[PDB]
Each structure stands twice: as structure tokens, then as C-alpha cells.
Amino acid sequence: ASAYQRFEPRAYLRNNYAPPRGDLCNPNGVGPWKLRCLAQTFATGEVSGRTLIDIGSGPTVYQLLSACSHFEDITMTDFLEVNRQELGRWLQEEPGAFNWSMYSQHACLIEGKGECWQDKERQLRARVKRVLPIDVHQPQPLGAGSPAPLPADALVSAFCLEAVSPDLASFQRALDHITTLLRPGGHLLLIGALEESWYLAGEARLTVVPVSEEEVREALVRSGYKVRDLRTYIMPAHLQTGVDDVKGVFFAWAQKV
Amino acid sequence: PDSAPGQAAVASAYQRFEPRAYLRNNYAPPRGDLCNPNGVGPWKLRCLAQTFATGEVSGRTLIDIGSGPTVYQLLSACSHFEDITMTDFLEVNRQELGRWLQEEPGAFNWSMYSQHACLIEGKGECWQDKERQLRARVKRVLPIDVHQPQPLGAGSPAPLPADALVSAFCLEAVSPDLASFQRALDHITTLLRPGGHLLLIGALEESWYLAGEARLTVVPVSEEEVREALVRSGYKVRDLRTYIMPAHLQTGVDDVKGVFFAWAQKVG
Ligand SMILES: Nc1ncnc2c1ncn2[C@@H]1O[C@H](CSCC[C@H](N)C(=O)O)[C@@H](O)[C@H]1O
Ligand SMILES: Nc1ncnc2c1ncn2[C@@H]1O[C@H](CSCC[C@H](N)C(=O)O)[C@@H](O)[C@H]1O
Structure with missing residues (x-):
């Protein structure tokens, strides 16, 4: 895990949220897709409460843009x-x-x-x-x-778990761990990379567990979640830019039973 | 009786018009504050977008009359016309x-x-x-x-005649009086084809505004005077709405009391 010690925030933002991945003008891109999943889910009116916690925020805030208008108390977090x-x-x-x-x-x-x-x-x-x-x-x-404020009414976490876990089981346990912060009947918005094994952050090369949609689904289940929604975005060629090997992106809306 | 003198005063005054000061006075905040939907900025844009949204105003060629240093007046128009002429005196x-x-x-x-x-x-x-x-x-x-x-x-x-005209805060800002306004309206109307559209936006009951050193004279007009002039020029008025300038947006840069927006279609 010592890898995260060389992790360069600016290079991560650059690799992931500046053009081409950061070009929001094209509706077919990954940027617009992530924001769309987030916005659609909150527009339902079913993810609501007072406090929210964002797990593994890194240096990014986009994952809360639609969320902030539904939660008055927001907590952001990161290991680094x-x-x-x-x-x-x-x-x-x-x-x-x-x-x-x-x-x-x-x-x-x-x-x-x-x-x-x-x-x-x-x-x-x-x-x-x-x-x-x-x-x-x-x-x-x-x-x-x-x-x-614990327990939170809702959780968000993007590209954290799979990126900090050596394998499937560690991924499972981490999901168990964060789930304890989530109040029963609470909501979790989990976003992450599909079938990814590494990505770069300046001098750092990070290891990632390659997960599939069915594996994400099943983990949420084994954690005590009811999966309300799970969608996939396939990474087009032009956004496969040498900074990693992510094949796609999944979005999961899940509700703690 | 004789238009030259007033017109001459007008040209004289505009030689001191400072584009940067005008931009600041009218399109930078508080008036350029687009977050407040009750503000004049959002209203101007809304009038434009809704009109073009009808699909009823389209064609090949558009001419913007008295553009000055602004482009906001063409943001909703530009998806509906492939040839756009911009214009100004200065x-x-x-x-x-x-x-x-x-x-x-x-x-x-x-x-x-x-x-x-x-x-x-x-x-x-x-x-x-x-x-x-x-x-x-x-x-x-x-x-x-x-x-x-x-x-x-x-x-x-x-390309004349155009399929449509836009003109924002021009006519009244350069016309010494109503008869001058009317004549100017008649003049620009020759550039439009019969059945074409004019989107006219302007100040209501304004007599002066600042643009740096220059303190320029405006004929103050009412909604009804605008409507009558449109009719007098051979238009049917499809829409004419009014915005009252809120006190917090009256800033000493002018004495505009409200704003009008006219959607009108030349007869023919
Ligand atoms: N052991 C650990 N527990 C929780 N977060 C960790 C962790 N080790 C690394 N992280 C954080 O996991 C993040 C992965 S990338 C940042 C994801 C960001 N939310 C976005 O959506 O782009 C990094 O910020 C990293 O520092
Ligand atoms: N005789 C004349 N004929 C046509 N336009 C004139 C004119 N005399 C001055 N103008 C222009 O009329 C403009 C008034 S200011 C309005 C500019 C812009 N359309 C807006 O929406 O903010 C100035 O740009 C001025 O230079």
C-alpha cells in the first residue's frame, strides 16, 4: 500500500479530469456520464437526509455537485x-x-x-x-x-475501494467497513472502474483489483445492500490514454436493508 | 421638419462612447449577475431563447442592428441562422x-x-x-x-433582404425624439423581407446613460409608443413584454425605468 505515498494529486487530476477525459462538451464522454448518473439518482427524491459522507474523496469534488443540494452536512475524506x-x-x-x-x-x-x-x-x-x-x-x-455525525443518512464513494484493494476479498471487507458508517435504510452511491488493474499518479503506480459488474453487484449484496440500480459505461478507445487500463465504469445505487 | 441637427448631435456624442465602460456599466455585475433570475440579464436571455424556441423564427440570413460591443443578443439566434451580419456606427x-x-x-x-x-x-x-x-x-x-x-x-x-433582424438598445439610444425613432425603425425595416421577423429589445423611459466620459441622450419611450411604431412600420406585434428595472439595478449609469422586448413580423 506504500504506493499511495508517491501518489501525486495534481498528476491524478491531470490524468483523469483534464482533457480528453475532462472534456465535458461531448455527451458521449466519461465525464458527462459520471455526472449524469449522480444527477439522475438524486433527482428521484429518494436519496435524502441530513448528513452525507464521501469515502476516498481524493482531490476531487465533482462527486458531490448534485449531492450537496440534498444534504446540509457533508463530510469529505481521504487517506492522504x-x-x-x-x-x-x-x-x-x-x-x-x-x-x-x-x-x-x-x-x-x-x-x-x-x-x-x-x-x-x-x-x-x-x-x-x-x-x-x-x-x-x-x-x-x-x-x-x-x-x-454518525451514522450518515447516505454515502458516496468514487474510484476508492477497487483502487485500494489487492483483491476481491479485500474489496469485500472494505465495503463491509464503510457500510458500518451507513445508517440502516441509508443510501450508498458507489462509482468505480471496471476490470482495471493499474493507474498512474505522477511517480506512483497504483495497483487496482479488476472487478466486473456482477462482482460489484454480489459484493453489495453480501454487504447487506439492496441494489436499486447498477449501470455500466464502456471506456471508448479515445479515452484510453496510457494513464491506466480501465475498461469501463460502473455506477451503483444501493440501499442498506 | 429637419433631421440633420439632432442626428448631428448624436454622432457628436458617440465620438466619446467608451466601449469598455459601457460593457462594464451594463454587462458586468450587478446587471451582469446572471445568478439572480429576477435580474435584467437573465430576462434579456430568456426573451431571446423562448422566442427562438418556438421554431417560428428561422431562415438563412440574420442582421443584428446596432450590435455595439455585445454578442449576448445572438447567443440563442446563432443556432437558427447560418449567415449573421453584425453592425455598428462606431x-x-x-x-x-x-x-x-x-x-x-x-x-x-x-x-x-x-x-x-x-x-x-x-x-x-x-x-x-x-x-x-x-x-x-x-x-x-x-x-x-x-x-x-x-x-x-x-x-x-x-445579403438583402434578411430573413430576420435583431436590434438591442439601439434605436432609442440614437434617436433624439419619437419621430426620429419611427424613421429609424422605417429605415431598418427595408432590410427585412416581408414575412420576416424583428426582435427588438430596448430601454423604457430612458433619457440618458453613461459610457465613460460620454453622457448620451436617449428618447424616453413607453411600451405603447413602441407598439404603435411597430404597427406604423408595417409589422404585426406577436409579443411585447416588459421588465421593470428593480431599484437595486438602477446604479447611476442611466435612468432606464424598465426594458421592453418586441417580437414582430413584417407584413407581406
Ligand atoms: N487505505 C485507504 N482507505 C481509504 N481511501 C484510500 C486508502 N488508500 C488510498 N486511498 C484514496 O483512494 C483514492 C483513489 S482515487 C480518488 C478517487 C476520487 N474520489 C475520484 O473520484 O476521482 C485516492 O484519493 C487515495 O489516496
Ligand atoms: N446613427 C446610428 N445608427 C445605428 N447604430 C448607432 C448609431 N449611433 C450609435 N449607434 C450604436 O448604438 C449602440 C447603442 S448601445 C447598445 C449596444 C448593444 N446592441 C447592446 O445590446 O448593449 C452603440 O453601440 C452605438 O455605437
Whole structure:
């Protein structure tokens, strides 16, 4: 796991959220797809409550753009301090922060409530109350005396679990671990790569467990989830850019029984 | 009785018009604040988008009358016309457009407007595609004087007659009085084909505005005077709506009391 110690936030953002993967203009791309799954799910009105926790946020905030308008108390997390630092730079409008505005705009476009992207960001920054350390390999991922209001009404996690797990079983356990933070009847929005085995973050090469959609489905089940929705996006050739070997992306809406 | 003097005053005044100050005064916040849907900015765009959304205003050629240094007035139009002529009396304004067309950084930044237009047209178009289409479709930027019987001049490049006209805050801003306004309206109407459409936006009951040093005179007009002039020019008025300028948007840059938007279709 020491690999994550060389993990470079800026190179990750560059490899994953700048063009071409970051070009949101084309509806057929992966960016628009991720935002679409997130927006559609919240527009249902069925994922609701007061507190939400984002698992393995890394240096990215897009995974909460549609979420922030349904949850007044949001908790962001990551294993790496550099990532938490990088998040602070955006939440605080500090210098050299990452530019997420194309995403705020597209979330506003997709949601179709006529909202200006600045209001969207304003609300997100306002509702993220804390950025906490987290280790999903631990039975209590957040630790013992966490400031985060537990249990959460809902969880989000994107491209974390499969990316921090050596194999299927470790993936399963981590899902078990985060699930304990989720209140019964609560909701989980799980996003991640399909059949991926490595990706690069500057000097770091990270190992990934290659999971399939049926494997994701079954794990959610064995964790005590009812799968409300599971969709797949197949990675087009032009977005296979040498920064990894992800074949596709899955999105899961699941509900703790 | 004799139009030259007033027209002469007008041209004289506009020699001091400062495009950057005008852009700031009218299209930068608070008026450029597109987040507040009760604001004048969102209303202008909404009037435009909804009209084009009917599918009822289309064709090949469009001419924008008195563009000045602004492009927001063409954001919803540009998907409906493949040939767009832009126009202004002042070279400096035309130079400003030229700067946006070349996509220079020195240019006024209209992307908030492009975004918002994309937002309310509701087709999920990204703003960079919106802008790229506008840039591609503007075929020319021409000098114009609406007080001339032939506003574009003799033997213009413009494809005439156009299928549609846009004109925003021009006529009233350059007409000393109502009869001048009416005449200007008559003049631009010759550039439009019968059965074609005019989208007219303008200030209501405005007598002055600032554009840097220049303090320019506007004929104050009412909604009914606008309607009558349209009828007098040979249009059917399809739509005429009004926006009242909220106090918080009255900022000492002018004395506009409200804004009007007219959708009118030339008879023939
Ligand atoms: N043992 C662990 N427990 C929880 N998160 C971990 C972890 N080891 C690494 N991580 C974090 O897992 C993330 C994988 S990539 C970041 C994903 C981000 N949410 C996005 O959607 O793009 C990195 O931020 C990494 O630092
Ligand atoms: N005699 C004339 N004929 C046509 N346009 C004129 C004119 N005299 C001045 N103008 C232009 O009328 C404009 C008024 S300002 C409105 C500009 C822009 N359409 C907007 O929507 O903000 C200025 O650009 C001015 O240069």
C-alpha cells in the first residue's frame, strides 16, 4: 500500500479530469456520464437526509455537485493528507486550487433547474463541514472519536475501494467497513472502474483489483445492500490514454436493508 | 421638419462612447449577475431563447442592428441562422467585436452569458460549442447608420433582404425624439423581407446613460409608443413584454425605468 505515498494529486487530476477525459462538451464522454448518473439518482427524491459522507474523496469534488443540494452536512475524506490539503485549496478558494467550474456548469446543465454554477459551488463549499482522514481497511474507517455525525443518512464513494484493494476479498471487507458508517435504510452511491488493474499518479503506480459488474453487484449484496440500480459505461478507445487500463465504469445505487 | 441637427448631435456624442465602460456599466455585475433570475440579464436571455424556441423564427440570413460591443443578443439566434451580419456606427465597437471573434484574451469575456444561454435553452449544449457556432456564423461586421434611408449604405455586402433582424438598445439610444425613432425603425425595416421577423429589445423611459466620459441622450419611450411604431412600420406585434428595472439595478449609469422586448413580423 506504500504506493499511495508517491501518489501525486495534481498528476491524478491531470490524468483523469483534464482533457480528453475532462472534456465535458461531448455527451458521449466519461465525464458527462459520471455526472449524469449522480444527477439522475438524486433527482428521484429518494436519496435524502441530513448528513452525507464521501469515502476516498481524493482531490476531487465533482462527486458531490448534485449531492450537496440534498444534504446540509457533508463530510469529505481521504487517506492522504496531500489530497486533503488539495481539497482545502478548493473549499477555501486558496491559490492554485483545481478548476472544477466546467463540472459545476455541467451539473447545473444536467440538473436543469436553471441554477447558475456559482450558486452550486457556493452551496457545496458551504455544506462540506469537514475533511477527515480515513482508512477503509480499518473496521472503523474513520476511527473512534470522529467529528463526523454518525451514522450518515447516505454515502458516496468514487474510484476508492477497487483502487485500494489487492483483491476481491479485500474489496469485500472494505465495503463491509464503510457500510458500518451507513445508517440502516441509508443510501450508498458507489462509482468505480471496471476490470482495471493499474493507474498512474505522477511517480506512483497504483495497483487496482479488476472487478466486473456482477462482482460489484454480489459484493453489495453480501454487504447487506439492496441494489436499486447498477449501470455500466464502456471506456471508448479515445479515452484510453496510457494513464491506466480501465475498461469501463460502473455506477451503483444501493440501499442498506 | 429637419433631421440633420439632432442626428448631428448624436454622432457628436458617440465620438466619446467608451466601449469598455459601457460593457462594464451594463454587462458586468450587478446587471451582469446572471445568478439572480429576477435580474435584467437573465430576462434579456430568456426573451431571446423562448422566442427562438418556438421554431417560428428561422431562415438563412440574420442582421443584428446596432450590435455595439455585445454578442449576448445572438447567443440563442446563432443556432437558427447560418449567415449573421453584425453592425455598428462606431469603429471602436466593431474593433471590440473583432477581438471577441479572434478569441483574444484582451476581449470582453462573454462565457457567463454563453453558459446561461446554454442553461435555459435546455439542450445540454456546452458553452464552448455555443461560442464556436456564433463565431462561425458571423459572416461580417459592418458600419451602420440607422438614420440613413439605406442604413447599411449603397451596394452593401449584406445579403438583402434578411430573413430576420435583431436590434438591442439601439434605436432609442440614437434617436433624439419619437419621430426620429419611427424613421429609424422605417429605415431598418427595408432590410427585412416581408414575412420576416424583428426582435427588438430596448430601454423604457430612458433619457440618458453613461459610457465613460460620454453622457448620451436617449428618447424616453413607453411600451405603447413602441407598439404603435411597430404597427406604423408595417409589422404585426406577436409579443411585447416588459421588465421593470428593480431599484437595486438602477446604479447611476442611466435612468432606464424598465426594458421592453418586441417580437414582430413584417407584413407581406
Ligand atoms: N487505505 C485507504 N482507505 C481509504 N481511501 C484510500 C486508502 N488508500 C488510498 N486511498 C484514496 O483512494 C483514492 C483513489 S482515487 C480518488 C478517487 C476520487 N474520489 C475520484 O473520484 O476521482 C485516492 O484519493 C487515495 O489516496
Ligand atoms: N446613427 C446610428 N445608427 C445605428 N447604430 C448607432 C448609431 N449611433 C450609435 N449607434 C450604436 O448604438 C449602440 C447603442 S448601445 C447598445 C449596444 C448593444 N446592441 C447592446 O445590446 O448593449 C452603440 O453601440 C452605438 O455605437
